[PDB]
Symmetry: C4
Subunit: 349 residues, 4 copies
C-alpha cells in the first residue's frame, strides 16, 4: 500500500472535515462524486456545466451541495470548493472494472488525470477513493472498531501465552536446562504476536482519530516485545550476532519469512531437519537479556561481560570482584548484576 | 449436519463473491431466488420464460439481475449466470413447510431436483438454503460475531477455572495427596471447555473469512488442552490404558456422554456410587503428564519409565543412575526427568 | 416482580414461537394487539367483529394476521389463534396511564379481565405486556446483551479484587495476623459481587434462550463464592454460629441490608462505632474455611475439630495423633488436615 | 466545561423524562426546537403564534407536540409545557456559526436570552444544546458506550502494566536496590492511567443513568491508585514532603504537566538532564507506602517512625523493642510493622 496513496487516504479519515461531510452524506443517502484538483483552470475539458463557486470549504457546504446531481470539485488541500453540479467527462476508452456510471466515471477520471476522485453510492455506505491507478475502499468506523476489537482480543491471548512461555523459559534459563525447542517455541509466539499487529495496522490507520484508544492498547500489549525477542535471538543464536543482525532477523519472521520451528532454528545457526530433534539440542544463553533488562547494563557494555564469561551460567557465579574485572562495569554495575541474578534465582527457584 | 450440506454452505459463506452479492441484495431489500444447476438444458421443464444469458458470473451482475422479478439460474460452481427473470415451476404436490410463494417454491424445487436453491425475502435479512431435503438458514455476520464473542468470553472463564484447578492439582500431585475428587473435578472442567468449543464450531464455520480471528482465539485458548486431559486420564485411570483408549474417553465426554462426577470416575475404572465418596478415594499419578509435558520424554519411552517405577512419586525419588536403568532413556533424559521433577517440587512447595 | 407475572413474561421470551413472530412483526413495523384468552366464548362482549378462525397457532400465521388492523385473540397456552382483526372494547372508565388508543385499550382490557394483553406499536420496537394490574416492558435482545455484557465485565473486576483480597487474607490467616478490617473488607467485596448478580438476574431471565452463555459466564465467575463467604462469617463471627445462621447473614447483605464496614462488623457480633477502629480489632479464624475447602472435611465433623482446638492456629500445630483424638476424623482425615495446612503455610510463607 | 453548562446537560441526560422524549423524537425523525424559559410572560417578543398550553410536562406529551411544526416552550425545571407550534424570532443580527434555520435560530435565541435551547434535526440523530454562548452536542448512548468500553479496555491494560511495574518495584524496595528509573517508570504509568480516567469522565457524565456500570468498573480499576502514587512520591522524593504536597504533585501530572521521565524526577527534587542518567541514581524508600498500606499505620504516626529510622531498610531491621521506642506506636503497632515487613521479605525473596 504505497505511501502516496496513504497520504490521500488520510484526507477522508475520521477526524477530517471532509470525512464528517462524507459521513453525513452517507447517512442521508445522497450520492457523491468528488474531484480533487489544484488548478481548476486546467481541467476545463473534463468539467462541463454546473456552477462556478470558488468558495471556502466546509463540511456543511459540501453536504448541501451534495443534494444536487453530478459532481463537486475541490482543491487538493480541501480548502476550496470550486464547482458543484458538474458533469465530469473522462475518456471513455480508458479501461475500467467498475459498475455503474458513477464509479466508472471516477476510475476513468482518476487514471486520466492522476488526481483523486471520491465516489459514494446512494445505497451502499462505502467510500471508494480512486487515485491514478489505485482504488482504495474506506470502511465505516462501526466496521473498523469491530475488527480491531476482535484483533486486540486475539492479541491478548497471544500475549498471555507468550508470557507463560517466557516465564517458563526464565526458570529453565536460570537453571541452565534450556533446549532449542524452548527457545524456538518462545520466539515463534512472539513472532506471531507482532505479525498480528502488522496485519491490523492498516485498520488502525483507517480509523484515524477514532483509533486513538486502539493505538494505546496495542502499545501496552507490545511495548517491550520487540526488544525482548531481539535479546532472545542474541542469547541463543548458535554463533554470536550484533544487535543489528538480530534486529533484522526479528524484522523478518514478522514480514518476509513464515516462522516455523525448523525455520527459526536454521536461521538461528542450527542445522536441524525435524521437529522432534529440537528437544535434544541443548543451549545456554549468553546473558544479554537479563543483563540489559534486569541488571540495566547497556548492551554496549553487555558484550564485554559476555566475552569474558561466555554465558549467563558463568555470570551468575561471578563474584563482584570477578565481575568488576570487566571493562565497562565498575562497582555499581557489579553489584547490579550479581544482585539481579542472585535475586531472580532465589525467587524463581 | 451432513458434509455434503456443509460444502454447499461454504458457497454462500463470507468471502465468496456470491455472498458479497447476496449481502448487497439484502441491503437493498431486493428479494432473491437462485437455482444452482449444472446442465441448464435438463431443467427445461422447471424453468419458464425470462432471459437466456449464458454469461460469466460476477457479484455486480447478480445484484443487477436481482432488481427484476422471478428467479436467477446459476451454474453449481457459480461461474456462469444462465437465466434471469425466470418463473420456476416445481411439482406443487411436493410437501412443503414453508410460508409464501418464494420459499415454498425453493423448498419444492430443491427436493424435486436435488439441487441447491437459495431464497432471500425482501424484508427479512436472512439467507435460506434448500438442498435436497435439507434447509439451512445462514445468519448475518453481525449476529454471528456477537454469539461467537460471547462464547469466547465464556470459554475464557472456563479456561481460567480450569487453570486454577490444574495448578491446584499440580501441588497435590507433587505431594502425593491426590483424591479422585481432585482428578474428576479437573477433568470435568476440561471436558466442559472442549464441549463449548464443539457447540460453537458451526458458527465459526458460518463466519467463513470473517472468522479468522475467532479461529485464532480458540486455538490459543485450547491448544494443549486435549493432550493434557488425555494425559490426566492416562495418569489416574484405575488400570493402565494406551494413549488411544484415553484419547477415546476424551473424545466421548466431549460428545456422546455427559461428564458427571460419578460418570467420569466409573469410566475411569472406579466403582463409585455417590458424590461424597470421591473425596475418600486416594490416587497416585503414574507420571505421564509431567514426563511428556515437562521432561519432554516421548510417550513412547514414557511407558518404560512408568512400568519400572509405577508412579510419579517413585520417579521423583529415583537417582539419575536409577532412572538410567530404564530403556529408552539415557544420560540426557535421566537428568531431564530428575531435574524437571526436582525443579517443580522446590518451586511449588 | 411477582412470579405469576414471571410465568407470563416467559411466553414472549427469546426462544418461543410467539417471540419469533413478535420479532418479525417489530421488524416489519406492523403494530400488534394480542389478547390471551382461554375460553373465547366468555369474552363475547369485549370482542367485536373480525374473523373467527379457531386455527392452530404458528409464528408465520400470527405474522400474516398482523398485517390487518385491530387485535388478534390467542389461547393462553399459545396453541390456538381464535380471532383476527377484532375490535377490543374494554370499559373506558377504567383508569389508564397509557398514551394512544392501542396501549390504553391493552391496559384497560388486561385490568378488566385479568388476562394477558400484548401491545406493540408500529414505530417503537418495544413489547409491552399488560396482565391484571401489571405492566412489563420487554426489551430487544440487542439491548439486553449489551447491558449483560457490561455487567459481566463489571463482575469480572469485582471478582479480581475479591480474589486479591482473599489471597491477601489467606497470608494473614496462616500467620494469625488478621484484624476485623481485613475480614470486613473481604466480606464487603463478596457481598457487592453477589448483589450485582442479583441486580442483573431479571435481564438474564428476559434474555431467555439467548442468555445461555451469560448464565454459564455468571456461574463460572461466582460458583463457590456463596460458600466461601458463609465460611468466612463462620470463621470470624464474634460468637460461634451454625451454617444456617451465617447462610442467612450472607443472604441479607445481598438483599435487605447494605453492607457498610460498621454494619458488617456489628452484624458479626462486634460492638464497633467508627471505621478506623476495625484495624485495631484482632481476630482468629476458627478454621472452618480451610477444613472444608482444603482439607475436604465435612462441616458436619468440622465443628468437632473446632470445639477441640478453638482456632486454626491451634489446628495448624496439632499432630496427626492429636488431630485423631477428635471424633469424626480418623487416620485419613488427620493427615488430610495436617498436610493441607502444612502445605499452605510452606507455600504462602 | 463550565459547571453551569454541566447542570444544563444533565437535563437531557439518559434517565430524565426529557431525554426519553428526545430519544423517541429522534427515533421518529421528527425534528425538535425547545426553548427553556421560566417566566413565559417575559419572552412575549421572541415567541409568536402557536398554542398556549400551560399543561403539566410528560414525555408522551412532548413527543406528540413534536409532530407539529415550529418550537415548543418549556419551564426551566421541565415541569410545564407552556407553548407548542410557536415561531421563535431572535435578533437575526446576532452572529451564528450554525447551518440551516433550526440551529441558527437556536444559537441566536440562546445567546439573546441566556436560556437553554435544544435543537434536534429530522435526519441527524444528534442533540445540540445551546445555552448563552455555549454549544454542547450530546451523543447517543450507542456511541458513548462504545467509546467508554474501549477506554475501560484501555485502562485494564494500563492497570496490568502498572501492577507488573509495582510488584517488580516491590522486590527492589525490599532488597534496597531501587533506582530513580524504577520509581519514575512506575509513577509515569500510574499518572497515565489516571489521565485516561480524566479524559473519559465527560463521557461517563454524558451517559447519565446508563453509565452506572462504567462508573463501578472505573472505581474497581482505580480505587487505591491515587493513594498509592501519593505514597510513592512521599517515599522517593529527594527531600521529605507532606501528604498535601505529594497529593498536589499527583494532581498535576494528571492535569497541568505531562509526565516525562526527566520531568517527574526533576519535580521529585532530582537534578537530572538525560534519560540514561536515571538508572544510575540510587534511592531508598522512607517506608510510608508499606507502613500505611501493609502495617496499617496511620500516616499521622508514620512520620514519627520515619524520622527515627529514616528508611524502610532500617525499619525492616528494627526489633519490636526498637520500634516501640517510637511515639505513636505501642506494642500492637510494633508487631504489626515488624511482622508485616518480615512477612513480605520472606514471601517476595
Ligand atoms: N460523469 C458523471 N458526472 C457527474 N455525475 C455523475 C456522473 N456519472 C454519474 N453521476 C452521478 O451518479 C448518479 C448515478 O450513479 P450510480 O452508478 O447509479 C450510483 P448509485 O445509484 O447511488 O449506486 P447504487 O447502484 O448503489 O444505487 C448520476 O445520477 C450522477 O448524479
Ligand atoms: N415460482 C416462483 N418463480 C420465480 N419467482 C418467484 C416464484 N415465487 C415467488 N417468486 C418471487 O418472490 C416474490 C414473492 O415471494 P414472497 O414469499 O412474497 C417473498 P417476500 O415478499 O420478500 O417476503 P416477505 O413476506 O418477508 O415480504 C415473487 O414476486 C417472485 O418475484
Ligand atoms: N380497541 C382497539 N381494538 C383493536 N385494535 C386497536 C384498538 N385500538 C387501537 N388498535 C389498533 O392500533 C392502532 C393505533 O394505535 P396507536 O396508539 O396509534 C399505536 P402506533 O401508531 O403504532 O404507535 P406510535 O405512536 O408509535 O405510532 C389502531 O389503528 C388499531 O389497528
Ligand atoms: N425560528 C423557527 N421557529 C420555530 N421553528 C423553526 C424555526 N426555524 C426552523 N424551525 C423548524 O425547523 C424546521 C427546518 O429546520 P432545518 O434546519 O431544515 C432542520 P432539518 O431539516 O431536520 O435538518 P436536516 O438538514 O438534517 O434535514 C422548520 O420547518 C421549523 O419547523
Amino acid at each position: 500500500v504505497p505511501q502516496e496513496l496513504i497520504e490521500k487516504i488520510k484526507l477522508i479519515s475520521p477526524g477530517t472535515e471532509l470525512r464528517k461531510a462524507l459521513d453525513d452524506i452517507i447517512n442521508a443517502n445522497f450520492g457523491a462524486l468528488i474531484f480533487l484538483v489544484d488548478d481548476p483552470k486546467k481541467y476545463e475539458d473534463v468539467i462541463q456545466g454546473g456552477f462556478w463557486l470558488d468558495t471556502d470549504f466546509s463540511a456543511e457546504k459540501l453536504y448541501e451541495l451534495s443534494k444536487m446531481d453530478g459532481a463537486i470539485v475541490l482543491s487538493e488541500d480541501i480548502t476550496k470548493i470550486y464547482y458543484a453540479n458538474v458533469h465530469l467527462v473522462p475518456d471513455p476508452t480508458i479501461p475500467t472494472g467498475e459498475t455503474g456510471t458513477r464509479h466508472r466515471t471516477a476510475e476513468r477520471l482518476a487514471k486520466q488525470t492522476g488526481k483523486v476522485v471520491i465516489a459514494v453510492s446512494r445505497r451502499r455506505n462505502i467510500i471508494s477513493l480512486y487515485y491514478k491507478n489505485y482504488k482504495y475502499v474506506v470502511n465505516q468506523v462501526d466496521f473498523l472498531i469491530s475488527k480491531v476489537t476482535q484483533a486486540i482480543s486475539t492479541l491478548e491471548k497471544y500475549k498471555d501465552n507468550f508470557n507463560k512461555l517466557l516465564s517458563e523459559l526464565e526458570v529453565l534459563e536460570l537453571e541452565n536446562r534450556v533446549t532449542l525447542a524452548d527457545v524456538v517455541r518462545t520466539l515463534a509466539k512472539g513472532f506471531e504476536l507482532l505479525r498480528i499487529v502488522e496485519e491490523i495496522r492498516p485498520y488502525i490507520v483507517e480509523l484515524g482519530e477514532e483509533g486513538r484508544l486502539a493505538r494505546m492498547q496495542l502499545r501496552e500489549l507490545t511495548e517491550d516485545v520487540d526488544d525482548l525477542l531481539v535479546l532472545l535471538i542474541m542469547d541463543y543464536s548458535s554463533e554470536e550476532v550484533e544487535e543489528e543482525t538480530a534486529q533484522n532477523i526479528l524484522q523478518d519472521f514478522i514480514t518476509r519469512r513464515e516462522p516455523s520451528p525448523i525455520s527459526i532454528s536454521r536461521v538461528l545457526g542450527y542445522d536441524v531437519q525435524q521437529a522432534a530433534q529440537l528437544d535434544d539440542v541443548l543451549v545456554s544463553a549468553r546473558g544479554y537479556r537479563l543483563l540489559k533488562t534486569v541488571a540495566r547494563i547497556p548492551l554496549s557494555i553487555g558484550y564485554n561481560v559476555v566475552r569474558m564469561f561466555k554465558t549467563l551460567d558463568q555470570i551468575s557465579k561471578a563474584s563482584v570482584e570477578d565481575l568488576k574485572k570487566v571493562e565497562g562495569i565498575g562497582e555499581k554495575r557489579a553489584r547490579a548484576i550479581s544482585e539481579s541474578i542472585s535475586s531472580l534465582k532465589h525467587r524463581k527457584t
